[PDB]
Amino acid sequence: IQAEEWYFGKITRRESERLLLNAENPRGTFLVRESETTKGAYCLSVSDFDNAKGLNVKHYKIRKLDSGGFYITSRTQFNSLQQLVAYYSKHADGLCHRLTTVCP
Amino acid sequence: SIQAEEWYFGKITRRESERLLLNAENPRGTFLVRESETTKGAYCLSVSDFDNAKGLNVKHYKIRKLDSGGFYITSRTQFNSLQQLVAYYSKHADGLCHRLTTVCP
């Protein structure tokens, strides 16, 4: 997945929030990183805006099933990470915002 | 002035640096220096590498600016300038994934 624009590898949770939390960035700017402590998991980081908290980053753990697939909820699972990203770019389904822009 | 150095790419993002380095045309050890996007005062050395499992991949090493003037990536050597840092690791990888071979174009 190294070659996917949205994959930032092993940046920490804090570093993903420093990258994402920028006022030039739209709601739904996102990146995927390898989870910092859970081994074999990915994490989807999405900026979001709430009146109160202002801009903040939500983090959703992505698990990989034994057969290979990926999921965030029981609603949909994906044969690959790129399919998950493609799906959520069009359908938020429970995430805070549709994935609009890859982290610059 | 570091602004006009050919291997200095200023404020480009971590993501744009990889888009530049991760390209078939570039030898292992193609590099660029840039500012850290979020560590103030630090710089960053981005280097292309090739691992059969990863494929072509970029490694990023932070460069800290000593208060007293220098620059360093490890406790083994410190340098007075970024120029001198690039030159040294062009000869000796000394912990880096690869010697700095090619300035990124």
UniProtKB/Swiss-Prot annotation, chain A:
Tissue specificity remark: Expressed ubiquitously. Expressed in the skin (at protein level). Platelets, neurons and osteoclasts express 5-fold to 200-fold higher levels than most other tissues.
PTM summary: The phosphorylated form is termed pp60c-src. S-nitrosylation is important for activation of its kinase activity.
Residues bearing the modification Phosphotyrosine: Y42
Domain SH2 residue range list: 6-103
Places the protein is found: Cell membrane; Mitochondrion inner membrane; Nucleus; Cytoplasm, Cytoskeleton
Transmembrane segments: none
Comment block on domains: The SH2 and SH3 domains are important for the intramolecular and intermolecular interactions that regulate catalytic activity, localization, and substrate recruitment.
Family: Belongs to the protein kinase superfamily. Tyr protein kinase family. SRC subfamily.
Self-association and partners: Part of a complex comprised of PTPRA, BCAR1, BCAR3 (via SH2 domain) and SRC; the formation of the complex is dependent on integrin mediated-tyrosine phosphorylation of PTPRA. Interacts with DDEF1/ASAP1; via the SH3 domain. Interacts with CCPG1. Identified in a complex containing FGFR4, NCAM1, CDH2, PLCG1, FRS2, SRC, SHC1, GAP43 and CTTN. Interacts with ERBB2, STAT1 and PNN. Interacts with DDR1, DDR2 and DAB2. Interacts with CDCP1, TGFB1I1 and TOM1L2. Interacts with the cytoplasmic domain of MUC1, phosphorylates it and increases binding of MUC1 with beta-catenin. (Microbial infection) Interacts with HEV ORF3 protein; via the SH3 domain.
Entry function: Non-receptor protein tyrosine kinase which is activated following engagement of many different classes of cellular receptors including immune response receptors, integrins and other adhesion receptors, receptor protein tyrosine kinases, G protein-coupled receptors as well as cytokine receptors. Participates in signaling pathways that control a diverse spectrum of biological activities including gene transcription, immune response, cell adhesion, cell cycle progression, apoptosis, migration, and transformation.
Other comment: May be involved in blister formation in Pemphigus vulgaris, phosphorylated-SRC is abundant at blister sites but not in normally adherent tissue, which corresponds with loss and disruption of CDH1 in cells adjacent to blisters. Phosphorylated SRC is increasingly abundant at pre-lesional sites of blister formation and occurs prior to changes in abundance of CDH1 and DSG3.
Disease named in the record: SRC kinase activity has been shown to be increased in several tumor tissues and tumor cell lines such as colon carcinoma cells. Thrombocytopenia 6: A form of thrombocytopenia, a hematologic disorder defined by a decrease in the number of platelets in circulating blood, resulting in the potential for increased bleeding and decreased ability for clotting. THC6 is an autosomal dominant form. Affected individuals may also have bone abnormalities and an increased risk for myelofibrosis.
Name of protein: Proto-oncogene tyrosine-protein kinase Src
Gene: SRC
Shown residues in whole-protein numbering: 146 to 249 of 536
